[PDB]
From a paper:
Vγ9Vδ2 T cells—a major subtype of human circulating γδ T cells—respond to multiple cancers and infectious diseases in an MHC-independent manner; they are specifically activated by small, non-peptidic diphosphate metabolites called pAgs. The sensing of pAgs in target cells requires a surface protein, BTN3A112–17, that has both intracellular and extracellular domains. Here we show how—in both humans and alpaca—multiple pAgs function as ‘molecular glues’ to promote heteromeric association between the intracellular domains of BTN3A1 and the structurally similar butyrophilin BTN2A1. The BTN3A1–pAg complex functions as a composite interface that directly binds to BTN2A1, bridged by the pAg molecule at the centre of the interface.
There are two BTN2A1 B30.2 molecules and two HMBPP-bound BTN3A1 B30.2 molecules in one asymmetric unit. The two BTN2A1 B30.2 polypeptides constitute a homodimer, basically as found in the apo-form BTN2A1 B30.2 structure. BTN3A1 engagement with HMBPP forms a composite interface for direct binding to BTN2A1, with HMBPP positioned at the centre of the interface. The Pα phosphate of HMBPP forms two interactions with BTN2A1: one hydrogen bond and one salt bridge with Arg477 (BTN2A1, B chain), and one hydrogen bond with the main chain N atom of Val511 (BTN2A1, A chain, at 2.9 Å). The Pβ phosphate forms a hydrogen bond with Thr510 (BTN2A1, A chain, at 2.7 Å). To test whether the HMBPP-mediated BTN2A1–BTN3A1 association results in Vγ9Vδ2 T cell activation, we mutated BTN2A1’s Arg477, Thr510 and Val511 residues, each of which directly interacts with HMBPP. In contrast to wild-type (WT) BTN2A1, none of these BTN2A1 B30.2 mutants associated with BTN3A1 B30.2 or caused Vγ9Vδ2 T cell activation in the presence of HMBPP, indicating that HMBPP’s ‘glue’ role is required for γδ T cell activation. We generated a BTN2A1 double mutant (D455G/E457R) to disrupt the interaction of those residues (Asp455 and Glu457) with BTN3A1’s Trp350 and Trp391 residues and found that these mutations significantly reduced the extent of HMBPP-triggered Vγ9Vδ2 T cell activation. Notably, we discovered a significantly enhanced binding affinity of HMBPP (KD = 46.8 nM) compared with its affinity for BTN3A1 alone (KD = 1.64 µM), a value much closer to the observed cellular activity of HMBPP in γδ T cell activation.
Author numbering:
A (entry chain C): 304 to 484
B (entry chain D): 305 to 482
C (entry chain A), D (entry chain B): 322 to 521
The structure:
Amino acid sequence: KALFKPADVILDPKTANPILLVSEDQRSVQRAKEPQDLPDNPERFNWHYCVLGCESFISGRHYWEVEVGDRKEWHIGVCSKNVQRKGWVKMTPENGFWTMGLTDGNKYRTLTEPRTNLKLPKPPKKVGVFLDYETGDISFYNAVDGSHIHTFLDVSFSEALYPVFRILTLEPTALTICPAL
Amino acid sequence: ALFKPADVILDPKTANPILLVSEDQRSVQRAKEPQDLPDNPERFNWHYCVLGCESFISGRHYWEVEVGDRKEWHIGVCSKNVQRKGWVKMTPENGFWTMGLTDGNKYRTLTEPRTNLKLPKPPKKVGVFLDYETGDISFYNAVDGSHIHTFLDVSFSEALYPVFRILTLEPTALTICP
Amino acid sequence: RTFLHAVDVVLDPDTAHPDLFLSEDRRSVRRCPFRHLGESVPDNPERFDSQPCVLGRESFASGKHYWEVEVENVIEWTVGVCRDSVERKGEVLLIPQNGFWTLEMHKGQYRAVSSPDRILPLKESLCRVGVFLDYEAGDVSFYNMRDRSHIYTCPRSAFSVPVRPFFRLGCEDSPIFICPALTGANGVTVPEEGLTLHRV
Amino acid sequence: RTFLHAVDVVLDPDTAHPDLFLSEDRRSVRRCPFRHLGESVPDNPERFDSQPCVLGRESFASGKHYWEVEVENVIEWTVGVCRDSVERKGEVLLIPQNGFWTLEMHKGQYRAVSSPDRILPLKESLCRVGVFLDYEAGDVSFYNMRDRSHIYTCPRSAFSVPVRPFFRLGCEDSPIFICPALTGANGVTVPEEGLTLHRV
Ligand SMILES: C/C(=C\COP(=O)(O)OP(=O)(O)O)CO
Ligand SMILES: C/C(=C\COP(=O)(O)OP(=O)(O)O)CO
């Protein structure tokens, strides 16, 4: 644990799909009912309901924590700087995304090819994300009871990696980064 | 002869893309689907209309149109400044003085409102007479000389073109007698 | 400008007469008479106040556009298109002269342009009606979407200003539904086997 | 480019398998096998030579597009979307990896992406089927147009090249019809009282 530097992760509004609302403090993200009137600048995801952090990882060991609370739909992890941001692409390691999450309230998945269903004994409310750049590892943990959720050992170690967050649903609970602390 | 016979040639720059102007610019037919032509200002982009090349600014003129047994056609004259872009109702108040045939046997004058005409015989050839100064336009069966309709005492403020309109895809073309 | 646009019609709540009750998604509406009884309703120049009408938020100044409306089990209703400039406060006849192009159900009859002199001889009860607009053509047309058969085209009209989808209910607690445009799997996870029989 | 396009689909006779018999308007098709008996049919590169298929003449490289097909009383049919570049020659497999996205009726059942492992549990006979494309979404969806209900969305795919309407007939003397886009009174005199129950 101690080997993993807490990352200070802030959402980059220039990257957020127009249907996303980034809080003023750049820590939380909700969905709008309908897309907002924003420029389609090159940084922005124009199809996937995604937003990146401002800072990318290029070396070292890093940790951040995400409050998912009782949200019924969310996906998080990292993605390469060079991912396709315009039009649908499958969010999988081969297209530069390393993400997992929840759909339909109780169906936890790893977003790989093909998708697999994850066994979670407890619904997590807080997810810890551990990245070891050099060993191409990203691991997901229940940040409350410390239990393991899923690991990728095939993360790029040649591309800058952004934290990435995705929400499809319109619901009360935001998705919130716990600030470096 | 009281009217100078006009030499009317169809202006393909004015023809709706769905109309086919013959090689010699004296006859017009309908295509199955619009051709790919530019939307130059002169072209009728909605009504299935085509103008003559020459407009009338004074004097007395006539021309004759073979309608054949075509089940649908309207002809007459219109003002230079009529709306060529989008539908406008073809009426004197919008700059159109026209009459013709719809649905095999129903003759009308394109007045506001339209008026049904009672034609003893169906004409295969129609004569159009214009007198700019009085403001008269008249239609006649050109084979047997019967009257069809006259617009009386109009106050023309614009050059007038011969105008031709066909909606239906039929074998009988519409042809200007030279 | 050559494409037929299948419009996604969402109702504008600022136009809606106070007795109209909109669904949360603003794609369906019923009339609940005197539902503001004992209330003071605020002034709103966009709101229809003499007749129970509501507009689509979309406005059209050119092009060809259509949408579909489910009217099964409503028997006092009016649909079509109106100018954005129509009278909202006083009661007008819902006719082309006043900026309305409509198909009406009234006392068990289908009336073109809301006219007692334009009874449509239909031989079946309409369940889904297509409202078709061709701005440049001066064309508002109505279709029976059972067999996609033409019902009526209004006398051609110079719309001249932007026009809007128009809805009115003359009757109580029976809703009309405005059919959303098809979206496929927009906003949804498609599993790698496909998405089977999706329901909202 | 956010607009749903209601496509006017016309079949491309150059793609058509020689057993297919197109209507002259090219909006309907039936299969009459050995109808070129004793004839040498030119085998141009665009033509399907074994699969009894025909493409729409339209191709799509972006945006949202749909069309409707009448399939009532046809016991063997396929509809959908295919890449402009699909293999035309031999017994090509009509699957996504070969650039085909289909819904099929085969032996009284409905099958997605022409797969025996993807039988769709519909509770009614399809009569009018909607075919929907969202190019940037990788989306081909099918709809039951009786109630506009979702049937199936294929696995999301990178189309990569232009795609076209796809049709297959696996039975004889049973025509499918492609529903023309609505056109209102386009090409027709509207009387001053309106046009009533136009038929062609
Ligand atoms: C609509 C949407 C995402 C769904 O993507 P997909 O349909 O590719 O599914 P998955 O990535 O497996 O959840 C917006 O980000
Ligand atoms: C479709 C068409 C014209 C019909 O115009 P209208 O529908 O205004 O009828 P009419 O009374 O014949 O002038 C194309 O020129």
